[PDB]
Amino acid sequence: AKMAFTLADRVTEEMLADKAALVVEVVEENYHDAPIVGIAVVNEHGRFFLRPETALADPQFVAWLGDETKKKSMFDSKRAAVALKWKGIELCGVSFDLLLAAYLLDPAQGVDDVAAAAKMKQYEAVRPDEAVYGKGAKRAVPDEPVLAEHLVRKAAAIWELERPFLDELRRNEQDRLLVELEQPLSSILAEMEFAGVKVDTKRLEQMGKELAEQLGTVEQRIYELAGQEFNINSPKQLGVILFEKLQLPVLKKTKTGYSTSADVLEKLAPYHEIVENILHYRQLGKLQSTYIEGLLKVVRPDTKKVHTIFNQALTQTGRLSSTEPNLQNIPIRLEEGRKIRQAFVPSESDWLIFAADYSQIELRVLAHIAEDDNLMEAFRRDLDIHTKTAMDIFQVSEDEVTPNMRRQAKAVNFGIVYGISDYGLAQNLNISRKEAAEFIERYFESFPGVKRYMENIVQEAKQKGYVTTLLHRRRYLPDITSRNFNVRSFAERMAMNTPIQGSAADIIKKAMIDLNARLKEERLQAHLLLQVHDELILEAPKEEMERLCRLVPEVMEQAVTLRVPLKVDYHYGSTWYDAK
DNA sequence: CATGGCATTGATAA
DNA sequence: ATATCAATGCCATG
Numbered sequence: 383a384k385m386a387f388t389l390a391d392r393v394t395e396e397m398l399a400d401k402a403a404l405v406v407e408v409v410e411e412n413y414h415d416a417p418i419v420g421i422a423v424v425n426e427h428g429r430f431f432l433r434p435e436t437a438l439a440d441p442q443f444v445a446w447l448g449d450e451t452k453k454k455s456m457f458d459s460k461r462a463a464v465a466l467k468w469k470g471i472e473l474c475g476v477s478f479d480l481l482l483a484a485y486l487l488d489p490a491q492g493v494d495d496v497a498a499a500a501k502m503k504q505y506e507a508v509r510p511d512e513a514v515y516g517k518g519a520k521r522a523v524p525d526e527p528v529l530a531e532h533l534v535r536k537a538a539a540i541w542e543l544e545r546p547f548l549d550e551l552r553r554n555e556q557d558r559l560l561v562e563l564e565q566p567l568s569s570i571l572a573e574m575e576f577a578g579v580k581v582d583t584k585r586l587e588q589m590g591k592e593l594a595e596q597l598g599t600v601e602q603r604i605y606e607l608a609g610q611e612f613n614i615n616s617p618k619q620l621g622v623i624l625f626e627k628l629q630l631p632v633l634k635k636t637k638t639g640y641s642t643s644a645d646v647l648e649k650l651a652p653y654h655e656i657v658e659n660i661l662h663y664r665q666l667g668k669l670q671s672t673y674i675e676g677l678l679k680v681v682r683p684d685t686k687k688v689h690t691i692f693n694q695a696l697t698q699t700g701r702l703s704s705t706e707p708n709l710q711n712i713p714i715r716l717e718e719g720r721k722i723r724q725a726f727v728p729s730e731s732d733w734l735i736f737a738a739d740y741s742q743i744e745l746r747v748l749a750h751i752a753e754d755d756n757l758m759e760a761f762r763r764d765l766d767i768h769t770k771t772a773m774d775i776f777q778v779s780e781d782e783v784t785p786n787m788r789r790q791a792k793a794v795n796f797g798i799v800y801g802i803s804d805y806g807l808a809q810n811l812n813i814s815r816k817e818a819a820e821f822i823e824r825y826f827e828s829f830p831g832v833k834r835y836m837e838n839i840v841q842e843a844k845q846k847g848y849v850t851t852l853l854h855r856r857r858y859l860p861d862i863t864s865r866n867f868n869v870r871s872f873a874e875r876m877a878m879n880t881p882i883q884g885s886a887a888d889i890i891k892k893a894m895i896d897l898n899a900r901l902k903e904e905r906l907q908a909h910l911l912l913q914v915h916d917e918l919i920l921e922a923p924k925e926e927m928e929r930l931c932r933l934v935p936e937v938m939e940q941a942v943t944l945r946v947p948l949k950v951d952y953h954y955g956s957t958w959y960d961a962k
Numbered sequence: 963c964a965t966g967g968c969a970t971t972g973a974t975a976a
Numbered sequence: 977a978t979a980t981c982a983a984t985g986c987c988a989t990g
């Protein structure tokens with residue numbers, strides 16, 4: 383049976399109640415400067431559908447949107463907030479976001495539309511967006527009758543589902559996580575995305591020329607060494623040239639054929655000169671295709687800025703993800719790729735890029751959660767954690783720690799945070815399973831508290847069915863009881879890793895909220911641009927650097943209080959690259 | 963073709 | 977041994 387609603391030709395007073403489910407539909411996946419196809423409002427007075435041209439041109443409706451005393455319940459308010467920012471309209475008073483609520487209740491559900499969230503509470507009087515708009519090339523906004531009913535039904539679902547979702551969140555002790563962390567953060571992410579990051583396209587285009595020149599040289603060399611031309615970017619064809627024509631050893635055999643991954647080629651490097659060339663080709667090609675051509679495709683022609691979209695409701699650990707473009711994986715480890723960052727510049731004259739990062743936040747969180755005396759003392763002394771771990775597992779003094787020992791202790795540290803595994807560590811350090819197991823045993827002897835935590839967290843996940851982070855974010859782990867070893871082992875690693883990665887996520891998110899409040903208080907023009915899991919990137923007038931050097935690290939260091947200190951490093955400069 | 967999904971690869975946290 | 981996003985190649989699918 384159809385749902386009743388008023389398809390209004392104009393805005394009325396009863397459409398402006400002090401509480402309502404609001405739908406400001408943006409069908410385009412990338413909502414930056416995108417069209418708003420329709421509006422729906424459901425309140426105590428009934429259900430209404432409004433045409434965007436009408437509603438958004440009405441002084442009363444716009445004022446209602448920006449009145450924070452007029453409460454709105456929505457789904458993915460960030461999407462509406464940003465689409466409105468591009469139209470010069472401010473959205474305030476959003477007291478409930480169903481997308482974020484569902485995400486906190488169970489990130490594994492993958493809720494991406496009102497229907498999926500509603501299905502969680504046995505409410506199905508609403509269709510999936512995909513069912514209405516279609517998908518892929520065939521997607522499209524349907525006719526008004528169909529469009530209007532869909533938005534009203536979504537608005538109605540939100541109006542109906544707010545209470546039950548809030549009640550469960552409360553049961554889970556996640557009510558504050560939603561209202562005090564995620565929702566406020568949503569507005570901050572909206573400003574960040576809207577502000578965007580300025581790109582020096584000419585710089586980017588020149589790097590593209592340089593890379594194209596080098597890719598040509600190396601590409602020829604490869605054919606010259608292989609005795610024929612082939613698609614180097616084809617693991618299948620490449621695997622034939624290497625393991626069939628050149629007779630190179632087969633150390634790794636992929637599920638579909640021969641492995642040609644970096645780790646394998648490095649081992650094969652000694653056998654033939656073609657290998658080093660393939661590795662180099664891989665590097666350049668990745669930089670060119672993904673970063674040069676990739677970025678240039680999404681930069682706005684007019685402003686020369688890129689506007690990423692931070693997906694706040696996707697990762698299973700509580701982290702954010704970034705898309706179109708992904709600004710959370712810009713090269714930095716290798717110098718050639720690191721150069722890419724020189725293309726990210728301040729949006730105004732005489733402004734500078736300022737970057738602050740937590741130093742070893744995951745291991746510090748581990749020390750806190752496990753309450754390992756040795757690990758807590760290490761951070762209390764602000765010790766080089768990898769040198770310290772080597773000293774312990776190898777039983778030597780700081781002076782006796784060789785570069786190779788630190789490298790291995792470092793690999794052990796990453797394995798501990800990720801959820802230890804002898805095979806996993808062995809694979810990473812290219813050693814035997816047994817030898818890796820010995821390292822791990824050595825590590826637990828030196829950090830008994832960490833061992834206790836790993837055992838306890840797994841048992842707790844088994845008992846409760848989930849694990850939680852410092853601010854009460856949770857992740858259900860049904861596979862923890864599977865009789866399949868591989869399936870269960872993955873769930874156990876997730877049990878060990880989620881509370882660590884997740885808590886580090888909670889902390890930096892709170893720091894973002896605290897920082898924005900401090901910046902406003904100080905009336906500084908500095909503002910957040912990006913977040914990259916453990917670091918915050920801002921831009922600001924050069925005259926604000928000294929104040930930021932003190933303010934940012936402090937706010938980030940005091941976001942939460944742990945059994946160990948939180949340490950934040952910072953750098954600033956003409957470009958992102960220079961902010962080192 | 964026609965667009966679409968899987969496989970493999972590699973970039974970030976570092 | 978964790979969490980992501982996305983490019984190129986190649987076969988599914990019609």
Ligand SMILES: OC[C@H]1O[C@@](CO)(O[C@H]2O[C@H](CO)[C@@H](O)[C@H](O)[C@H]2O)[C@@H](O)[C@@H]1O
Nearest residue numbers: 411412458461494495691693694695705
């Ligand atoms: O608007 C972000 C928000 O929308 C979801 C779906 O509800 O993702 C959509 O938009 C993303 C940004 O363009 C795309 O990456 C994604 O493919 C599209 O479905 C949520 O996951 C997200 O939180």
Ligand SMILES: [Mg+2]
Nearest residue numbers: 739740741742
């Ligand atoms: Mg760091």
